[PDB]
Short mmCIF file of C-alpha atoms in Angstrom, two decimals:
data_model
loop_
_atom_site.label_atom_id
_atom_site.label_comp_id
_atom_site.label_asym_id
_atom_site.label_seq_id
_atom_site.Cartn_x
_atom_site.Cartn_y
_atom_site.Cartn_z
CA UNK A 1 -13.57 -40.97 6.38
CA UNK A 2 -12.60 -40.28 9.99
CA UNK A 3 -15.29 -38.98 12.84
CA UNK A 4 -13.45 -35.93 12.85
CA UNK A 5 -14.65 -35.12 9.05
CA UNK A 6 -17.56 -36.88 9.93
CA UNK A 7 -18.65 -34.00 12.64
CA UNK A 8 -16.82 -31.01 10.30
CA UNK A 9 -19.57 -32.20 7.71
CA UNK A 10 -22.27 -31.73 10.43
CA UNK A 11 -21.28 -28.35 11.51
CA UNK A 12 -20.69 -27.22 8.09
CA UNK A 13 -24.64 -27.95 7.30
CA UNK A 14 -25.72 -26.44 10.49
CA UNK A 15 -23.86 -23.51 10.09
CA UNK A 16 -25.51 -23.36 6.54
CA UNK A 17 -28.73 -23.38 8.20
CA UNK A 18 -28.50 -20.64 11.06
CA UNK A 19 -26.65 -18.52 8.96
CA UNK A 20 -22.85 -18.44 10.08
CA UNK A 21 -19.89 -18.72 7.45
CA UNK A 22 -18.42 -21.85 8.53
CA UNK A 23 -17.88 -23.95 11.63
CA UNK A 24 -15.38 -26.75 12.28
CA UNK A 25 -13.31 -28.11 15.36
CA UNK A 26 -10.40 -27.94 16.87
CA UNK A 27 -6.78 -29.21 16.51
CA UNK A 28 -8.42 -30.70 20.14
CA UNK A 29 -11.85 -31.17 18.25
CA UNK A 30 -13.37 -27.87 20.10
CA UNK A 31 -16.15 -25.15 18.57
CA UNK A 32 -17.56 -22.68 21.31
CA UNK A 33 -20.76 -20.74 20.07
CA UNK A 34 -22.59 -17.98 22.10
CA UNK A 35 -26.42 -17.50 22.15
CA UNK A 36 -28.11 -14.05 22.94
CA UNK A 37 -24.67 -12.85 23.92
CA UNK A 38 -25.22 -14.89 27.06
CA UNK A 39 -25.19 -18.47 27.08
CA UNK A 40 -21.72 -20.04 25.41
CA UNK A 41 -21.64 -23.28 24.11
CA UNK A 42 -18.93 -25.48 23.89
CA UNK A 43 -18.85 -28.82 21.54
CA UNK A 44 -16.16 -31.40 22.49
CA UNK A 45 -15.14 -34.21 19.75
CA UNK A 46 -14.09 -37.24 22.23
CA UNK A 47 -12.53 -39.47 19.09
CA UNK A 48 -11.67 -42.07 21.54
CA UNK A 49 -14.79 -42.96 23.03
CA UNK A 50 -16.73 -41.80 19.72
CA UNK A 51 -19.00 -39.10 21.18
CA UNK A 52 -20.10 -35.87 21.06
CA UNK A 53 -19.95 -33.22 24.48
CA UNK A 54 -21.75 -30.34 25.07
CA UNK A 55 -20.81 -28.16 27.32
CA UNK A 56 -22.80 -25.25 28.03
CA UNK A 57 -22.42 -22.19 30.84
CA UNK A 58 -25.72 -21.09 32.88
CA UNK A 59 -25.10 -18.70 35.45
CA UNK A 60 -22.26 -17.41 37.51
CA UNK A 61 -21.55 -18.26 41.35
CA UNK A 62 -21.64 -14.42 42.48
CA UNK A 63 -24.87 -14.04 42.25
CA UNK A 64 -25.73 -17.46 43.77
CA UNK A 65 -26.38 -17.81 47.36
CA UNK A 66 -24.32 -20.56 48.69
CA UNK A 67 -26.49 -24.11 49.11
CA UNK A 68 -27.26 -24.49 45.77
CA UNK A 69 -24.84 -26.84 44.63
CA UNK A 70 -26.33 -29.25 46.96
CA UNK A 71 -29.65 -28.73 45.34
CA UNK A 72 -27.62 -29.31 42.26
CA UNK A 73 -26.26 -32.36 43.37
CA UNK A 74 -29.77 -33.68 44.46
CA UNK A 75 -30.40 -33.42 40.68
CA UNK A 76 -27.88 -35.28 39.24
CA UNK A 77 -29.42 -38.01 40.99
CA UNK A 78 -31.77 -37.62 38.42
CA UNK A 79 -30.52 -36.59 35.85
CA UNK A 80 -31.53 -39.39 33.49
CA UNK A 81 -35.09 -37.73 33.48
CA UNK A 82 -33.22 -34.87 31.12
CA UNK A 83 -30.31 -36.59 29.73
CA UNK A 84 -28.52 -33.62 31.64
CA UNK A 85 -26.23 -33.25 34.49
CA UNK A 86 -24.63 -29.89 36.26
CA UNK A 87 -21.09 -29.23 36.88
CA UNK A 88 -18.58 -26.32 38.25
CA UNK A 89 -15.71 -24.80 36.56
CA UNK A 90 -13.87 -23.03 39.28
CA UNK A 91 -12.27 -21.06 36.84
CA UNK A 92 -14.29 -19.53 35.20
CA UNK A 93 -17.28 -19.19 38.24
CA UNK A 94 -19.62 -20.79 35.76
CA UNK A 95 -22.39 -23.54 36.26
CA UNK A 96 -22.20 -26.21 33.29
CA UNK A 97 -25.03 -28.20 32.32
CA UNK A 98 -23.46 -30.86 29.83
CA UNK A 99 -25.24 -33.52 27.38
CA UNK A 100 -23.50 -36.07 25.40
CA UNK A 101 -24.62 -37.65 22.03
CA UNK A 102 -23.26 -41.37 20.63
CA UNK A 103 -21.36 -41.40 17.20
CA UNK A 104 -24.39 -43.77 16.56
CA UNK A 105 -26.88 -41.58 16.75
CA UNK A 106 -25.03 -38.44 15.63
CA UNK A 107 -26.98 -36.74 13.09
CA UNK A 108 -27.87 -33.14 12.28
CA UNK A 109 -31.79 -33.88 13.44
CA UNK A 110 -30.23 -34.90 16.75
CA UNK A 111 -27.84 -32.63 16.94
CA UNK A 112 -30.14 -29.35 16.99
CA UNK A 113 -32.62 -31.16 18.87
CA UNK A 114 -29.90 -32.18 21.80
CA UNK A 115 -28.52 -28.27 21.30
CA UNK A 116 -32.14 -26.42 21.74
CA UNK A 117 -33.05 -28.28 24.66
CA UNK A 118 -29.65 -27.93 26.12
CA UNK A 119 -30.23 -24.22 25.60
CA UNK A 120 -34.22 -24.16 27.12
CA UNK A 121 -33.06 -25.78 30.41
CA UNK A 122 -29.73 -23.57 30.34
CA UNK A 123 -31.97 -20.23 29.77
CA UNK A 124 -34.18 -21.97 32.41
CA UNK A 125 -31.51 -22.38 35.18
CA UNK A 126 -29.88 -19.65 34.41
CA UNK A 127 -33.39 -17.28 35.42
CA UNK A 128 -34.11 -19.39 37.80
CA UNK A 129 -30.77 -19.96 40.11
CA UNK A 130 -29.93 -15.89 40.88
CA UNK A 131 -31.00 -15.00 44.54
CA UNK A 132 -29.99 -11.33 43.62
CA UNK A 133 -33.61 -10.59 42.39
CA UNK B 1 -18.50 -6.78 10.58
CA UNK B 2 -19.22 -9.99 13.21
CA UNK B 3 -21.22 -12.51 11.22
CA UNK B 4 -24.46 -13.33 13.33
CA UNK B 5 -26.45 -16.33 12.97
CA UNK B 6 -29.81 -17.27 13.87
CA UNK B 7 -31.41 -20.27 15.87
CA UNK B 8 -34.46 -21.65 17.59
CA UNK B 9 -35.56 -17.67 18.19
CA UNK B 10 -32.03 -16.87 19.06
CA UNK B 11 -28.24 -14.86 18.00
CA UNK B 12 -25.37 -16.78 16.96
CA UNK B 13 -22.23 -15.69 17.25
CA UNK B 14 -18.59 -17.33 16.88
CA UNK B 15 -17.28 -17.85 20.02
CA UNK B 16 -13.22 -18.15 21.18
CA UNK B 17 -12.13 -21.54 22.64
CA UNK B 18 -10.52 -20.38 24.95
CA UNK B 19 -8.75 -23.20 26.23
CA UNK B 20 -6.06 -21.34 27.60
CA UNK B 21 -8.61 -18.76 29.38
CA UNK B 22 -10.50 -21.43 31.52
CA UNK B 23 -10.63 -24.57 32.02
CA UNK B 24 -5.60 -45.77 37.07
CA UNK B 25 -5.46 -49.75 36.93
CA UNK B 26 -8.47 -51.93 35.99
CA UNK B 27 -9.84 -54.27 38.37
CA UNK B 28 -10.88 -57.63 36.60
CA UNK B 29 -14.86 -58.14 38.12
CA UNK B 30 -13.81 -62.29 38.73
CA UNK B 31 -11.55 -61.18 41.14
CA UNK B 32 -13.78 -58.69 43.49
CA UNK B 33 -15.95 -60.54 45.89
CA UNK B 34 -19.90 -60.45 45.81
CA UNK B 35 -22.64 -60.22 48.35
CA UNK B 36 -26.30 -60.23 47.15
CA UNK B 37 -28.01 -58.53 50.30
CA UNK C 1 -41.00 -58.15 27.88
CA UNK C 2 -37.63 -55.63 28.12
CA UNK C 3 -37.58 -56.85 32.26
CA UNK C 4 -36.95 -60.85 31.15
CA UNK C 5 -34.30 -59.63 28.78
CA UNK C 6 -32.37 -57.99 32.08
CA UNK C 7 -33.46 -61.10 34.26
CA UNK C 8 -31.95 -63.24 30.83
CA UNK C 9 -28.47 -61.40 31.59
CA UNK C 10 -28.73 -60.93 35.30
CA UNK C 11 -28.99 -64.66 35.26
CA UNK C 12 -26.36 -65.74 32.88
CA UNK C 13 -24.70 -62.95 34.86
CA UNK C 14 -25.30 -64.65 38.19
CA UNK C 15 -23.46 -67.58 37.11
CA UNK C 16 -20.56 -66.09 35.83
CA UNK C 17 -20.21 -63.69 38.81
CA UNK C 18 -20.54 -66.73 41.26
CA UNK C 19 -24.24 -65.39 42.92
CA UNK C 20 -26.95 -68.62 43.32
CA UNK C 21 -29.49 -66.26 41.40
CA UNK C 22 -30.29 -63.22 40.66
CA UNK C 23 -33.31 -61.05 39.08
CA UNK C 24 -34.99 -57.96 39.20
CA UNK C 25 -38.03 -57.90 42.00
CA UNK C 26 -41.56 -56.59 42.06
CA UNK C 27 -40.26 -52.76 41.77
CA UNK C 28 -37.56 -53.41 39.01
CA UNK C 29 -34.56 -53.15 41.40
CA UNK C 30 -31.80 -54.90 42.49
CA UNK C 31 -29.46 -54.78 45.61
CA UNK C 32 -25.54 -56.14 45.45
CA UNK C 33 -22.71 -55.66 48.07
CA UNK C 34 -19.01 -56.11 46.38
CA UNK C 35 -15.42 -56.20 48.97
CA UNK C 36 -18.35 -55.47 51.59
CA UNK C 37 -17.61 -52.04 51.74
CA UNK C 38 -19.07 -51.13 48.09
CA UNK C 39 -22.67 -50.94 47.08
CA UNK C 40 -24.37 -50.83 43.69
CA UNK C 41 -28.22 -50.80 43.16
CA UNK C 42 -29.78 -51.73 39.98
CA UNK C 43 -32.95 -50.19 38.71
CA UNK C 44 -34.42 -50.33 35.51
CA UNK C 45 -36.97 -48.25 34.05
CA UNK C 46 -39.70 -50.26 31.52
CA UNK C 47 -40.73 -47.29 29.70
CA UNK C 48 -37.17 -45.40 29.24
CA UNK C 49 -35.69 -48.34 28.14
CA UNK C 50 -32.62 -47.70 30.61
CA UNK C 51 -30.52 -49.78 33.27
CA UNK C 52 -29.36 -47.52 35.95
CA UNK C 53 -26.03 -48.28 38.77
CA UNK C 54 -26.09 -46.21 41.62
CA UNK C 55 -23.19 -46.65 43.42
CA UNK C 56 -22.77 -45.57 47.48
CA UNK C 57 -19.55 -43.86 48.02
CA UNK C 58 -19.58 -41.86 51.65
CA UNK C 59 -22.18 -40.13 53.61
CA UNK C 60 -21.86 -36.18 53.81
CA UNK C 61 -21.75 -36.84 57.91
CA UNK C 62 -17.52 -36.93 57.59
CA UNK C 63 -17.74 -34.24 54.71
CA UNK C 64 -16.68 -30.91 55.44
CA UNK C 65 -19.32 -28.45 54.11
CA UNK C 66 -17.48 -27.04 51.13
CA UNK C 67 -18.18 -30.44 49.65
CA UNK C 68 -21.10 -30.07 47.47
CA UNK C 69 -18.72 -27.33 45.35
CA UNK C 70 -16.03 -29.94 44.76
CA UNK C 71 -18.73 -32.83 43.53
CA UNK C 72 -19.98 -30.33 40.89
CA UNK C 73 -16.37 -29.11 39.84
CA UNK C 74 -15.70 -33.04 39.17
CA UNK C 75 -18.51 -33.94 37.39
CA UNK C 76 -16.70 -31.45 34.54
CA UNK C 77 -13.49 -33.95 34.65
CA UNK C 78 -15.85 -37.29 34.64
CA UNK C 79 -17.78 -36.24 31.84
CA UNK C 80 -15.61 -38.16 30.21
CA UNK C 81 -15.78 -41.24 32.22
CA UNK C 82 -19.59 -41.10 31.50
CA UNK C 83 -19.69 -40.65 35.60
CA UNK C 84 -20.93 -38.02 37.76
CA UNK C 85 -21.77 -37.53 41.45
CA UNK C 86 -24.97 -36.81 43.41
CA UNK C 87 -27.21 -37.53 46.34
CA UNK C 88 -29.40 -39.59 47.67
CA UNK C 89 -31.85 -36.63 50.18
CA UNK C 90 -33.71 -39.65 52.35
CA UNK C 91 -30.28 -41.86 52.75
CA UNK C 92 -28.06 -39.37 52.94
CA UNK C 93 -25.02 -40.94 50.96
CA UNK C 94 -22.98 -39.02 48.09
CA UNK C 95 -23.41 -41.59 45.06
CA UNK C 96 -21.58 -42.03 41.54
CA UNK C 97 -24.00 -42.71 38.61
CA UNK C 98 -24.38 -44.54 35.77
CA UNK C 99 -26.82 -45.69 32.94
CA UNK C 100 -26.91 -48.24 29.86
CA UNK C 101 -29.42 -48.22 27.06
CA UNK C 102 -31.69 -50.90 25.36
CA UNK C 103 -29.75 -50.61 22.54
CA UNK C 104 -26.35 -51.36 24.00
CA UNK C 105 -27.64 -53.20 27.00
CA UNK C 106 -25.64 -56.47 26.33
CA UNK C 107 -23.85 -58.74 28.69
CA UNK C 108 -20.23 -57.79 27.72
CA UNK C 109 -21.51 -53.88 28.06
CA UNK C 110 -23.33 -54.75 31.71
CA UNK C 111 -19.62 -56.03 33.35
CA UNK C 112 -17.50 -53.60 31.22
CA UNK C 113 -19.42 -50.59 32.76
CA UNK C 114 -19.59 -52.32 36.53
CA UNK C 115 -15.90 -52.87 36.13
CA UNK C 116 -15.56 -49.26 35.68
CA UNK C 117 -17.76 -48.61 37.96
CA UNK C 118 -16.58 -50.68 41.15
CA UNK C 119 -13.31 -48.68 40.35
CA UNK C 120 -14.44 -45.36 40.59
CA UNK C 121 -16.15 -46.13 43.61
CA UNK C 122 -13.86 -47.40 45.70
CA UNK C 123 -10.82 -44.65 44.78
CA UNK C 124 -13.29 -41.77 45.70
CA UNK C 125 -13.94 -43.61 48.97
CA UNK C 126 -10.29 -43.43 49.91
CA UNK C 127 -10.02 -39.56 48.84
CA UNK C 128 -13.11 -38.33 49.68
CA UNK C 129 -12.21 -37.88 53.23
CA UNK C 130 -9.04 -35.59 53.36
#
């Protein structure tokens, strides 16, 4: 059985749980979700280096005032405390906080557990970040 | 109807990829020189 | 006894890599200069069970100030490289990062990822400034 099937089997049982139909990847191993019709989610199948990516968006540059992505950067440096790192997708004009999991330690367990927390610090960011007020 | 799924107190909704929407040579280590400072 | 397992591979390591010695001190860090013009720092943290590489690439004083935007917009792209950039406040230095678990914290693992590394470093050095 491939990782590809491997992860299909996942989402199938997770999709079972929250109550959606079905969920599989990609012909590029890609599934995008979308939480209180305002954080997406994105999950990445990486078959080459045999890991999973999350990819999820936060908040949009507009209503950012500009210095921020250096206070960004500042926490990438540690972003080993979280498992989590931010990134930019010019783009779109959305801020990305991403978290990876191992083929090794792939399971549905970890899965939800690395997808809620991804969410609480998204949600987090994403009230937090906005100058606008 | 849009089927809507449910978790960790929040919606769940199928979401488009929307790939189309938005979006080098190894150096061996015995070679490179070393300097413990 | 995790920090005599890295001091176990720093100093098989140290032979292999041509250094007299080499081990953690009091803190848990480490300090190496490679070409002379690249820098990586060990540290490892006892109770996360992690080994982390931060690598100086260039200070933000020959940066333009639309810099911080690009660092963010490539840490999307080196997600895949398990690599991402960000800053050091006191120093002052833009840095690449990089970690390696207990669990696949082997000698083989240690070089592969400071190959990689090294690499990465020093072809951001050359573009950075542009």
């Amino acid at each position: 059985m491939d990782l590809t099937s491997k992860v299909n089997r996942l989402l199938a049982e997770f999709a079972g749980r929250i109550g959606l139909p079905s969920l599989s990847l990609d012909e590029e191993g890609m599934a995008s979700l979308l939480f209180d019709e305002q954080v997406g989610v994105t999950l990445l199948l990486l078959a080459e280096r045999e890991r999973l990516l999350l990819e999820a968006d936060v908040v949009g540059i507009d209503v950012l005032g500009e210095g921020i992505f250096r206070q960004l950067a500042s926490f990438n440096r540690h972003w080993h405390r979280f498992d989590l790192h931010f990134g930019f997708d010019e783009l779109t004009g959305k801020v990305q906080l991403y978290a990876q999991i191992l083929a090794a330690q792939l399971t549905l367990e970890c899965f939800e557990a690395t997808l809620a927390n991804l969410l609480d610090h998204a949600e987090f960011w994403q009230r937090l970040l906005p100058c606008a007020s | 109807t849009e089927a809507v799924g449910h978790f960790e107190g929040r919606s769940v909704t199928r979401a488009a990829v929307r790939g189309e929407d938005r979006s080098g040579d190894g150096t061996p280590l015995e070679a490179r020189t070393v300097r413990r400072r």
